[PDB]
């Protein structure tokens, strides 16, 4: 090939040449420049005014190779900064790419899919603009086959990824009707046997569940929660991670939505998740637990029955600090919403000492959360007339020293809560 390492000047010469073949060779040279790993000259290409030419080449049905080369060039320009993506959009690329989705050449339609994914991936405004130009119907039409396995793997992964970008970002979240239009295909992809397709489908679902309970309900109504729990159990970390994100999102919802997560058998996976060697998995699992323990007393009871309280004690005792903070939250929610018997059980599992140990942390918020938890537990103790036993318990593991020291803490609610605790139970 004689299209390797052209100067931008030569590329411009060729593209301006009145010869379709010359334009093709120059466009390919541009593509090869724009696809080098080391500092591709995107800004130089833009400054040379080439984008409108590329876009015009997208429409040359009579010359599919120049459609492909220009599609790839524009794809890589749109992969850059918001400004570079914007240069591509401003060139008129969106309807051109959408028109290319119908191309009889798989590599060309695929490249169009990819490009639209980059443009939509820039953010809410471009995402919504891609949708207004009508991308969703032809995109989905590309998946209208009896069995997804007959499609090329790379092709399918690219499509799934671009759809996931149409589901991504907030303020605003995607249009409700767009979400409803995309969701069934997402469900189908969520049952496809490829790890990357599964990962990206899961990520899409996680985007869609990241919002108000109505948004969550749109997803939950499609019946995907059991599949999410199954994927939650997968060996591949790139699958588990978005599965767990989606599940956590869903349990930020209503008691009924959360209950749907529990009924699908999610809790059975949390012994592993709460001890997972990957820090973010442990953190997000504990976050998820914290929103489940903020639930109803029967839901708290299901957490108890699945033997998960000792795992919460474990995470509180030793974990990455952020995970520990999530655990503190889980405990404060548990003690706020739990029965006296459930709180007693919590104490019997050994929550007090690690709770106290975290009072030496340099984080005001977790101090507040923990003090709140201690307050709730003391309330249970009062209800049982066992406040003295709890006071002794806290004193013996050195909790009293820490609480006494929190009196001199600078934050108001902290020394107020701690002084209250001291004056009420440790006199």
């Amino acid at each position: 090939q004689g299209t390797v390492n052209w100067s931008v000047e030569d590329i411009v010469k060729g593209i301006n040449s009145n010869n379709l073949e010359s334009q093709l060779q120059a466009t390919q040279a541009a593509r090869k420049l724009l696809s080098r790993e080391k500092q591709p000259p995107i800004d130089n290409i833009i400054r040379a005014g080439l984008i409108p030419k590329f876009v015009s080449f997208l429409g040359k049905t009579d010359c599919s190779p120049i459609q492909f080369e220009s599609a790839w060039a524009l794809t890589n320009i749109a992969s850059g900064t918001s400004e570079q993506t914007k240069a591509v959009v401003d060139g008129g690329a969106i309807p051109a790419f959408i028109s290319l989705l119908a191309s009889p050449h798989a590599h060309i339609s695929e490249q169009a899919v990819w490009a639209l994914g980059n443009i939509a991936g820039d953010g809410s405004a471009f995402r919504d603009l891609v949708i207004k130009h009508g991308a969703i119907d032809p995109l989905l039409a590309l998946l209208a086959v009896p069995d997804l396995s007959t499609l090329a793997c790379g092709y399918l992964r690219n499509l799934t990824w671009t759809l996931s970008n149409l589901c991504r970002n907030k303020n605003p979240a995607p249009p409700l009707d767009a979400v409803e239009q995309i969701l069934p295909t997402l469900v189908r992809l969520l049952h496809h046997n490829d790890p990357e397709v599964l990962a990206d489908s899961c990520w899409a679902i996680s985007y869609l569940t990241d919002g108000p309970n109505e948004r969550i309900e749109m997803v939950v109504k499609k019946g995907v929660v059991p599949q999410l729990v199954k994927l939650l159990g997968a060996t591949e970390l790139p699958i588990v991670t978005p599965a767990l994100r989606a599940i956590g999102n869903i349990v930020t919802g209503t008691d009924e939505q959360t209950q749907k997560v529990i009924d699908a058998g999610a809790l059975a996976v949390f012994p592993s998740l709460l001890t997972n060697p990957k820090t973010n998995i442990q953190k997000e699992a504990t976050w998820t637990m914290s929103n489940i323990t903020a639930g109803r007393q029967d839901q708290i009871q299901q957490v108890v029955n699945h033997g998960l309280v000792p795992f919460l004690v474990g995470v509180l005792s030793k974990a990455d600090f952020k995970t520990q903070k999530e655990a503190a939250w889980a405990i404060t929610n548990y003690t706020s919403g739990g029965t006296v018997e459930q709180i007693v059980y919590l104490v019997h599992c050994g929550i007090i000492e690690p709770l106290m140990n975290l009072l030496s942390a340099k984080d005001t918020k977790i101090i507040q959360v923990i003090l709140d938890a201690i307050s709730n537990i003391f309330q249970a103790a009062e209800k049982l007339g066992e406040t003295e036993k709890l006071s002794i318990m806290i004193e013996e593991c050195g909790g009293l020293d820490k609480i006494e020291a929190l009196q001199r803490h600078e934050n108001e609610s902290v020394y107020k809560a701690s002084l209250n605790l001291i004056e009420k139970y440790f006199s």
Partner: peptide, 13 residues
């Protein structure tokens, strides 16, 4: 982080 990239660059094959 571990999420899919927002944009993807198609590199030399």
């Amino acid at each position: 982080d571990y999420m899919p990239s927002m944009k993807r660059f198609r590199r030399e094959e």
